[PDB]
Design a protein around this nucleic acid. Structure first.
Lengths: 149, 83, 129, 83, 185
RNA sequence: AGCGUUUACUUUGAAAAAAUUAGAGUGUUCAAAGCAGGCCGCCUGGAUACCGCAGCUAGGAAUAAUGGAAUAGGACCGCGG
């Protein structure tokens, strides 16, 4: 079930058995690597690079076409953004809810949902601290959380 | 059910259901034993032999006694394998 | 969430047996499950089984016979000393004649009979009788 | 049904089952070679695209994103790619 | 010769003959530019059931992809040479022993038994790829693996089933049946 | 004689006061006890087990923790030093 909801949703991807790249695909490891570099440097998250490839170019999964995961390509090349692109999105949402809530003061629901999002920021922030993706000093504080975009 | 000597010592051996492999107790009055006749290959007449099948009470009232008898008959070669 | 995998494997066998199924599907297979089911099979409580192999945790289809009464797990996995096998198998097993306690020793995963045979303790996983 | 062949299900039953609840999970999606009414070059498009796939040089737009499968525009033939 | 062995030892007149049959094929065939830097490691000759044999050739792991590129066109030429004996190409993978307590870096999990045995079974049946595997645990405790191959290249591969089972048995010591299933493609 | 990712687990060995308890021998006339006794000077016992947990020691490596290369400041091999 969902972390902060009563729902029990079963909706995600289902990878096929065969990890082999199909015959029709002519894009080689270096061609998709040049493509990934171009998309990331345009300004685009590992998620959005992945969907662009499979929709338009027809790249089933980059881990089979290449030997790497999109972020390991980008962090090897040194195009990986510092604070991760799920921690980023949680902070971005939390700022968007607080900016709404600073105006609409009697929004008791927005107050409750802000508490849930922030509990999720802390919980993911500490995972990244243990795995040495962040400094041990890294803090989520709503005072100067907007400094992080 | 024999001692160190090898004398069969318990007073009887209860039949086991042909389907589920459960044992058919003394006061199990919803169990069956159905003799299915044997046909002579060329004439199409009754030989005088049959393939007997015992079935448990729980299997019958569950309603799998039909499909169970069917599988046992199909395995014994009574019912055609195409069916 | 799924914290004990052997617990759910043995409960799903137990319900399938009671209900009167000929075979059952075990979802997340593991060495401990396959090593539990080989001990069961070796005495002849289950028939053959076939571990279906996707690129994840596998699946097991076990051919059930109708000669298994109960197969249960013991969580937590207590440290059964050799001098404690008796007082465990006294209250877990139905009789001194049939039934087995599989326990994970240094040698491998095996029943109380072979653990006594090789003069070894270990940790209780479950029982089948 | 007590006896069911769990190992060997017939294609219709496991074509029906939810994509995760099959024996070996497999996607219900695919890739399709799709072409425009004017141009000769073909484009690879995912079944459930979720972007707008522009014909190269933005000559036109091929698909449109929706709930499930991506709606291909009217007057564009397609041939689903297989391996 | 084109047969460089990992140890500085000398090729038995057998596999020298194979690597010198590759000298002949290089210098003649349309495959001349391809068989230039491409090398062979070793070639063993094993006796399968019935009255047949298979020549099993060892390729360096990085060069396998370049060998897979040409294999069917090359297997053809080497099978038309070597009379009535099947030939199959396998990348030679190192298999590091599991680190115990008695006794060095983290053993890379590519160099483990389960991984290389899955790699061997992938590299045997090259053109017709694997779609399914099932390990039938027989009643005695012994296991039998059942590899479901790609149904395309049925008649291209179905004549090498007994050979593949015999070779994989010699390498690893694992019993294999080879099926072509009918309910996917 | 030395060296060899740590830890729990398990089996072995050591070290563990007697008395009590379990327990072998022995007609306190039997028994509770007692450590005596037995044979025509001699012959004999006064055993053995049990004693958690922590500490010590040697085997085993299933199970459950924990560590190694990813800014390569990686292992090995050699040459300037």
């Amino acid at each position: 079930g969902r972390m902060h909801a009563p729902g029990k949703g079963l909706s995600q991807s289902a990878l096929p058995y065969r990890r082999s790249v199909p015959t029709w695909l002519k894009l080689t490891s270096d061609d998709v690597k040049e493509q990934i570099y171009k998309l990331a440097k345009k300004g685009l998250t590992p998620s959005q690079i992945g969907v662009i490839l499979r929709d338009s170019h027809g790249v089933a999964q980059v881990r089979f076409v290449t030997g790497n995961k999109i972020l390991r390509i980008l962090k090897s090349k040194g195009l990986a953004p510092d604070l991760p692109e799920d921690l980023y999105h949680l902070i971005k949402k939390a700022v968007a809810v607080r900016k709404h809530l600073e105006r609409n003061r009697k929004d008791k629901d927005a107050k409750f949902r802000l508490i849930l999002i922030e509990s999720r920021i802390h919980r993911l922030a500490r995972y990244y601290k243990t795995k040495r993706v962040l400094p041990p000093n890294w803090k989520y504080e709503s005072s100067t959380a907007s400094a992080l975009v | 059910m024999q001692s160190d000597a090898g004398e069969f010592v318990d007073l009887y051996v209860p039949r086991k259901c042909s389907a589920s492999n459960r044992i058919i107790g003394a006061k199990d009055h919803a169990s069956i034993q159905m003799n299915v006749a044997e046909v002579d290959k060329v004439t199409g007449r009754f030989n005088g032999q049959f393939k007997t099948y015992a079935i448990c009470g729980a299997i019958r009232r569950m309603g799998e006694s039909d499909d169970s008898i069917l599988r046992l008959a199909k395995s014994d070669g009574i019912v055609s394998n195409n069916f | 969430v799924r914290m004990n995998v052997l617990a759910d494997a043995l409960k799903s066998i137990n319900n399938a047996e009671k209900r009167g199924k000929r075979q059952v599907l075990i979802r997340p297979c593991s060495k401990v499950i396959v090593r539990f089911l080989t001990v069961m099979m070796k005495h002849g409580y289950i028939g053959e089984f076939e571990i279906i192999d996707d690129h994840r945790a596998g699946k097991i289809v076990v051919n059930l016979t109708g000669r298994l009464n109960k197969c249960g797990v013991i969580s937590p996995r207590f440290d059964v000393q050799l001098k404690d096998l008796e007082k465990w198998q006294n209250n877990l097993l139905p009789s001194r004649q049939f039934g087995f306690i599989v326990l994970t020793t240094s040698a491998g995963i095996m029943d109380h009979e072979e653990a006594r045979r090789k003069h070894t303790g270990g940790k209780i996983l479950g029982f089948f009788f | 049904p007590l006896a069911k062949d769990l190992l060997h299900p017939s294609p219709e039953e496991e074509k029906r089952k939810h994509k995760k609840k099959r024996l070996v999970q497999s996607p219900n999606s695919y890739f399709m070679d799709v072409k425009c009414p004017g141009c000769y070059k073909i484009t690879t498009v995912f079944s459930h695209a979720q972007t707008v796939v522009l014909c190269v040089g933005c000559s036109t737009v091929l698909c449109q994103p929706t709930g499930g499968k991506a709606r291909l525009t009217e007057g564009c033939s397609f041939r689903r790619k297989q391996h | 010769a084109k047969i460089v062995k990992p140890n500085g030892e000398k090729p038995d007149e057998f596999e020298s003959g194979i690597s010198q049959a590759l000298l002949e094929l290089e210098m003649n065939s349309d495959l001349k530019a391809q068989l230039r830097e491409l090398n062979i490691t070793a070639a063993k000759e094993i006796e399968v059931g019935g009255g047949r044999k298979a020549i099993i050739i060892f390729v360096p792991v990085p060069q396998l992809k370049s060998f897979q590129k040409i294999q069917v066109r090359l297997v053809r030429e080497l099978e038309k040479k070597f009379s009535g004996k099947h030939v199959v190409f396998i990348a030679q993978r190192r298999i590091l022993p599991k680190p115990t307590r008695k006794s060095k870096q983290k053993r890379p999990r590519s160099r483990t038994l389960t991984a290389v045995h899955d790699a061997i079974l992938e590299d045997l049946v090259f053109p017709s790829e694997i779609v399914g595997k099932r390990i039938r645990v027989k009643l005695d405790g012994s296991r039998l693996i059942k590899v479901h191959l790609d149904k395309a290249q049925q008649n291209n591969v179905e004549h090498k089933v007994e050979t593949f089972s015999g070779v994989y048995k010699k390498l690893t010591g694992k019993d294999v049946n080879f099926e072509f299933p009918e309910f996917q493609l």
